[PDB]
């Protein structure tokens, strides 16, 4: 999300008050990229679509052993 | 990078888990543990086709629960022995200097001695001037710093690698190195080696799997002369099963292929699961009983298919229970450890006070417990025979009960948990009845059946 | 030092389990870990995929957070 910060009167140096200048205002943005190149990986089967295991359990996301 | 094609389309035609570790005898690399993702990776490293490691790897990836990554242990090889005992074209696949596939061939009275010496003669200059072979029924083969691998190609002969390095000392070396493996397997099928591996496995909380061709497995129930007896007598836990092809292709991989991806949280048993690569057991009815009392599982074919039987371990405990206990331990300390680390990274590390200790109930109920209840591994509810509930409970000490010594050492203990395991179904019995004349009649007593007798004295 | 500079002692937080971005996990078996501990020689140890600093005992044996 964009953010904006504005100085408060307690942080303006006395010199800038004489010159009447405000600075250190800060903004933040994120740019959105377009798409240029795309790659495809096609596959043509000949005899039978590849079979899959009958393991109907939910696929675990991590290994129990961690040492 | 430059891409000439804005859109690229390459066409082709015809196209975590608990990783095991197999401790082989070889010298194809200097390290002591290497991870492979397919047999095609092992051949590049100079492993002969049909070699002990090659057979184990292909069986593991062929199961419904393949691990998709395997570890290979390394032990020094001093000699390899090819035994032609038994009546038997006999191709022997060899690889030398990791740069040639010397598939020597023999064709053949027909006694082993003829082929035994014939192959040794064929080995000479069959190049091959960097290795030696000496006959004697069997031939001894030895390398010089040349990688030499021998693998079965046909015939009845078998491969027997040999090494002076003892398993009992190697295992500590391979665990000091990368330890991300669960199943333990070896090719040192001597009686001493199996026992030593079993003892190590239970100390480091690994699972030991092995196969035996010993005929004493199903010897009469009163005779104790097999490995199964020794392991049983020591109250070890190891999933030993008796098979005939174990000593040719090392079918340990097939068993692992049916368990690597099986999540323990479901309480799923190993009973009746298929083992692609094994062969039906040919013993008679009495032999099956003898092996059962031995706690030596068998792979028996029924109604055309093949099915494992009873998954019992050496000590008599069911394997699924053993697996469940390890899963609870491993995935209970991990969740607590992970929560503690997150707190310390923020600077707000946990402190032993009554205001924070209670939080551990939410942590334990989150990762290990609730996952085990959705999948049905953990029972809940109320029992009317015992009149006792089955709900998990957790107790946490309060700051007033921690001894002053533990405060200095910063240790918390006496945390207690309670669980109930859910059993699968193995055997079912039916009592059918066929009527011939009339379905059995019943009394016209339409009163509600009384549940007790009035007289009680 | 990067894990202590901004950590004010007033919270009583310690160096246990803190992550050091750039060190390498200790490899020496498990007994070697025991020898170092008696030496008051802390080690960087990897567990569950990450890296964790274990105990900040000083040379005299007193914990660093106390000092």
């Amino acid at each position: 999300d964009p953010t904006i910060i504005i100085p408060k009167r307690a942080n303006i140096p006395t010199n800038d008050l004489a010159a009447r200048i405000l600075r250190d205002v800060k903004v933040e943005l994120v740019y959105n990229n377009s798409l240029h190149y795309v790659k495809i990986r096609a596959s043509v089967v000949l005899d039978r679509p590849a079979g899959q295991s009958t393991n109907a359990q939910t696929p675990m996301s991590s290994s129990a052993v961690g040492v | 990078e430059y891409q000439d094609k804005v859109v690229d389309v390459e066409v082709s035609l015809g196209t975590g888990f608990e990783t095991p570790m197999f401790l082989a005898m070889h010298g194809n690399f200097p390290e002591r543990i290497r991870f492979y993702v397919s047999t095609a990776g092992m051949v590049a490293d100079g492993f002969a086709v049909g070699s002990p490691a090659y057979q184990f790897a292909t069986n593991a990836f062929a199961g419904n629960f393949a691990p998709q990554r395997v570890a290979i242990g390394r032990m020094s090889i001093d000699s390899s022995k090819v035994d032609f005992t038994g009546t038997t074209e006999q191709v022997v696949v060899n690889i030398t200097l990791n740069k040639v596939v010397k598939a020597v061939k023999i064709n053949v009275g027909n006694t082993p001695a003829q082929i035994a010496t014939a192959l040794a003669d064929a080995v000479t200059a069959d190049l091959t001037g960097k290795a030696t072979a000496v006959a004697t029924t069997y031939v001894t083969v030895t390398a010089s710093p040349n990688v030499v691998s021998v693998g079965k190609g046909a015939g009845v002969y078998k491969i027997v690698n040999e090494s002076s390095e003892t398993v009992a000392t190697v295992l500590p070396s391979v665990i000091a190195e990368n330890h991300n493996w669960y199943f333990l397997a070896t090719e040192a099928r001597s009686d001493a080696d199996i026992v030593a591996a079993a003892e190590f496995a239970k100390a480091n909380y690994k699972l030991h799997i092995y196969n035996s061709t010993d005929v004493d497995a199903y010897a009469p129930e009163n005779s104790a002369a097999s490995v199964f007896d020794t392991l049983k007598s020591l109250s070890y836990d190891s999933l030993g099963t008796s098979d005939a092809g174990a000593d040719v292709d090392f079918t340990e991989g097939s068993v692992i292929g049916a368990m690597a991806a099986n999540d323990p949280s479901y309480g799923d048993s190993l009973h009746l699961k298929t083992m692609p690569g094994m062969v039906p057991f040919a013993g008679s009815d009495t032999q099956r009983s003898n092996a059962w009392s031995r706690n030596a599982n068998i792979y028996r074919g029924l109604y055309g298919g093949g099915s494992y039987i009873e998954g019992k371990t050496s000590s008599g405990q069911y394997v699924d229970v053993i697996r469940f206990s390890h899963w609870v331990k491993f995935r209970m300390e991990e969740s607590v450890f992970a929560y503690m680390k997150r707190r310390s990274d923020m600077g707000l590390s946990m402190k032993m006070s009554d205001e924070d200790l209670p939080v551990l109930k939410s942590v334990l109920m989150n990762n290990p417990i609730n996952i085990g209840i959705r999948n049905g591994g953990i029972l809940t509810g109320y029992d009317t025979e015992n009149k006792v509930s089955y709900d998990p409970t957790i107790i946490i000490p309060k700051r007033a009960n921690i001894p002053t010594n533990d405060l200095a050492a910063r240790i918390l203990r006496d945390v207690k948990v309670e669980l109930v395991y859910n059993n699968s179904l193995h055997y079912v019995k039916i009592r059918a009845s066929v009527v011939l004349d009339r379905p059995a009649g019943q009394s016209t007593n339409a009163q509600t059946p009384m549940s007790s007798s009035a007289v009680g004295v | 030092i990067g894990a202590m500079a901004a950590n004010d002692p007033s919270y009583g937080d310690s160096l246990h389990l803190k992550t050091m971005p750039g060190m390498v996990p200790f490899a020496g078996s498990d007994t070697q870990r025991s020898n170092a501990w008696s030496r008051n020689a802390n080690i960087y140890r990897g567990l569950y995929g990450g890296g964790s600093y274990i105990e900040g005992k000083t040379s005299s044996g007193q914990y660093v957070d106390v000092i």
């Binding site: 899959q52 295991s53 009958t54 393991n55 109907a56 939910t58 | 209840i373 959705r374 809940t380 | -």
Partner: protein
């Protein structure tokens, strides 16, 4: 048994994507975005003279898709222009895709069936476009663990 959460992430109406011709559609209204329905049942049953039951599969799979939009959306003008062009020339068939969230999805070829009725009133009105689609079989697609489940069903 106790209570259980059916999914892990909540169903989000904005995550449902509707594509007509190749452009996402925006401007939905009220509390119903799209409604997908069939025209005929999948199987018709016939009774016999001695208890036999004969079932016949249907070979028609057309359906309807009601799109609810505000009368302040530009897609109203897009659809009106497309309707006029189709009437003038003859091309009426355009692709239609709906990517559901935690639910069934659709991918077929559709056409404009009936123009809705405007109603200028005190509040902002609602226009409902009936889009007819060739095939109306919903596809599990994103939902995982379906191939294994299908082979689990027994029957004879």
């Amino acid at each position: 048994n106790q209570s259980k959460i059916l999914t892990l992430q909540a169903y989000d109406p904005a995550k449902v994507l509707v594509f007509i011709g190749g452009q996402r559609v925006s401007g939905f209204a009220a509390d119903t975005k799209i409604v997908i329905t069939r025209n005929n049942d999948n199987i018709s049953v016939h009774a016999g003279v001695d208890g036999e039951i004969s079932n016949a599969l249907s070979r028609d799979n057309t359906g309807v898709m009601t799109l609810s939009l505000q009368n302040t959306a530009k897609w109203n003008g897009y659809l009106a222009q497309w309707q006029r062009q189709a009437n003038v020339t003859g091309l009426i068939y355009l692709p239609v895709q709906v990517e559901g969230s935690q639910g069934l999805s659709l991918n077929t070829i559709g056409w404009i069936q009936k123009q809705p009725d405007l109603s200028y009133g005190t509040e902002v009105g609602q226009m409902d476009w009936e889009i007819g689609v060739l095939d109306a079989w919903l596809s599990p697609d994103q939902i995982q663990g379906i191939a294994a489940g299908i082979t689990g069903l027994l029957g004879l």
